[PDB]
């Protein structure tokens, strides 16, 4: 019943920045807690009873607020502080989590390195052609991959996957996979992925000729 709304839903801050996340409850709860969850890990209790740091939590984390408005503050964001942060109320049944605030590391711009991979003969013999385009170690996350087949822009036959931000260099990588039937693949020659990113002055095209 009690709705917990966090602001913002996502944030990219530089190491050393002051970070503030707010949590707003639909009803006054005057047991507000903050949890920190690394990707692929269980959440960890950071703050309890509004303003109390759990054991071992660095002093840079602090909590405040009352009634319906609450704030988690990171006084100086550290490289290991990237996570999704959740507020939680245990004052009124049923107990509810905020929707989470994903904090990622803001770094300098890095343009992607682009690679293209033709389908294997083994897969083709099974009747399907997967073409893979790789965008490696780039920042920020926004990028566009356009598939062109004999210079014809493709739509509806590709899927993308993006890695979680790398813990060491704070970059992303992206895969775009173009899937065609073997018959459709054999009708065309030039397979190209065209990449744009704010760090690229002009689009990067990687291509191959089928059967070459």
């Amino acid at each position: 019943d009690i709705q917990m709304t966090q602001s913002p839903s996502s944030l990219s801050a530089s190491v050393g920045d002051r970070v503030t996340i707010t949590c707003r409850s639909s009803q006054s709860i005057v047991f507000l807690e903050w949890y920190q969850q690394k990707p692929g890990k269980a959440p960890k209790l950071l703050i309890y009873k509004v303003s109390n740091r759990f054991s071992g939590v660095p002093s840079r984390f602090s909590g405040s607020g009352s009634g319906t408005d609450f704030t988690l503050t990171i006084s100086s964001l550290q490289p290991e502080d990237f996570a999704t942060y959740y507020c939680f109320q245990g004052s009124q049944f049923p107990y509810t989590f905020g929707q989470g605030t994903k904090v990622e590391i803001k770094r300098t711009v890095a343009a992607p390195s682009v690679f293209i991979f033709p389908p294997s003969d083994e897969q083709l013999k099974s009747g399907t052609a997967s073409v893979v385009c790789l965008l490696n170690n780039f920042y920020p996350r926004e990028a566009k991959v356009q598939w062109k087949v004999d210079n014809a822009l493709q739509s509806g036959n590709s899927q993308e996957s993006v890695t979680e931000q790398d813990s060491k260099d704070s970059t992303y990588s992206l895969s775009s996979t173009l899937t065609l039937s073997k018959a459709d693949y054999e009708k065309h020659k030039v397979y190209a992925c065209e990449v744009t990113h704010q760090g690229l002055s002009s689009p990067v095209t990687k291509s191959f000729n089928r059967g070459e």
Partner: protein, 213 residues
């Protein structure tokens, strides 16, 4: 102090599944044990909790009909029996101790166990090379498997730098697919062998794929 969830797996919609939470290192009976779930890429959702000392349970009304939480203090274990599962019940399910009678809630969490509710059946991946054509990229396409997870290593774990194993994406077929890639020196392609070792535990699939230029 440790919590270990078990019993997660693939279930057909409408089916049922019981999860377990084995506790160690503390008096299991005198602290509430909670179940908290998290759909892939989504937020945390509190399911319910039990006080193992007297068996007193509390459920979020959303689950009061078809979920049942129990505990065995002789085994230091709690259970989550889920009935009439739907696709939207797919999530990692955690058990978490709380100390809500004192000052805080979930201070100890288990690693979580993945429950997948889908009409897709268990299937091992096909593994195809992503052939390299002063840094080169190469990889393996790990396609059409279900359910999660898969693992990919390179050169039996001897190659770790520069490896990116992409998050799985569900295809229109309802099966997962991902690529695992690695960047290497272009001067190494002629004299260095690159092999991806794919393991899909749910199907007992193990595939080594030589990736050649």
């Amino acid at each position: 102090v440790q919590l270990v969830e078990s019993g997660g797996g693939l279930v057909q919609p409408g089916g049922s599944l019981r999860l377990s939470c084995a506790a160690s290192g503390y008096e299991f009976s005198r602290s509430w044990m909670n179940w908290v779930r998290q759909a892939p890429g989504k937020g945390l959702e509190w399911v319910g909790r039990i006080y193992p000392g007297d068996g007193d349970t509390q459920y979020s009304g959303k689950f009061k009909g078809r979920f049942t939480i129990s505990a065995d203090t002789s085994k230091n274990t709690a259970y989550l029996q889920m009935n009439s599962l739907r696709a939207e019940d797919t999530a990692v399910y955690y058990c978490a101790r709380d100390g809500s009678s004192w000052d805080w809630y979930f201070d100890v969490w288990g690693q979580g166990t993945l429950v997948t509710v889908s009409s897709a059946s268990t299937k091992g991946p096909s593994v195809f090379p992503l052939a390299p054509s002063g840094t080169a990229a190469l990889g393996c396409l790990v396609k059409d498997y279900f359910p999660e997870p898969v693992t990919v290593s390179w050169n039996s774990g001897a190659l770790t730098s520069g490896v990116h194993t992409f998050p799985a994406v569900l295809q229109s077929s309802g099966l997962y697919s991902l690529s695992s890639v690695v960047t290497v020196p272009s001067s190494s392609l002629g004299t260095q062998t690159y092999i991806c070792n794919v393991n899909h535990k749910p199907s007992n699939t193990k595939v080594d794929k030589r990736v050649e230029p």
